[PDB]
Design a protein around this ligand. Sequence first.
Ligand SMILES: *S(=O)(=O)Cc1ccc(C=C)cc1
Ligand SMILES: [Ca+2]
Ligand SMILES: [Cl-]
Length: 269
Amino acid sequence: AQSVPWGISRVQAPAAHNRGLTGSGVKVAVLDTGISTHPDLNIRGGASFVPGEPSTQDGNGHGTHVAGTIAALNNSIGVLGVAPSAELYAVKVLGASGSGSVSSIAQGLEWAGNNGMHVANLSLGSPSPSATLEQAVNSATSRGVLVVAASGNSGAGSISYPARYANAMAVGATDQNNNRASFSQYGAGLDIVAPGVNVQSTYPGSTYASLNGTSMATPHVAGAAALVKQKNPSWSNVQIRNHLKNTATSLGSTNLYGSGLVNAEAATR
Ligand SMILES: *S(=O)(=O)Cc1ccc(C=C)cc1
Ligand SMILES: [Ca+2]
Ligand SMILES: [Cl-]
């Protein structure tokens, strides 16, 4: 049996699926700890930039979890992604510990821009800026990648990097009441929010697990971007980003929520 995690329903992905929109034909890179082989995922390719971890399999769990929020397969098992037919790429930039470097992350962004990705999900970041990282965000953006990044989990009213950069689409986290999760960073540069509490997804060991974080919110938006790109193949990264924001549901101040809660139904209508 398949179930639909609450956040997938909250962003109204099923309404898009019912119009034939699944993310088919859209390439989405998950820049994270890898993605493990899993019967509810279809991994098309990828690359590793973590020295000593040359495989793209996931020794941590987070990247597999993020991948399933984007793209868990629509079938009779497991869960269901926002964009269940997205073409899914494992771009390992963080090791099994959950950390990498700005260089590995930048290499993953450059890979995305050199390999035809439409969306790059970066459920990662730091409170400090990075010139290396910034250059790579801008380069990927110039190559047509929509960079979608987590705002961070410190609870502060400023957002972390790379989400803070103008050419990243910064995503904060909401709870089941459509309030900002206490940990979700907010403030200048915040673009949008999505579910990030008690998010069930695919997990290594061919299982399913729940996590909290802006890392869980981000892939809802990356998946919604893929739905919008399938509907509107000619659109740029900027057009997709703007449309997601323009069709989001206001939840409160722009400082706290950006444009508000992503709405895949309104974005694909
Ligand atoms: S996540 O699991 O919520 C991990 C994570 C995401 C983002 C940052 C900073 C932007 C840090 C950790
Ligand atoms: Ca499934
Ligand atoms: Cl729906």
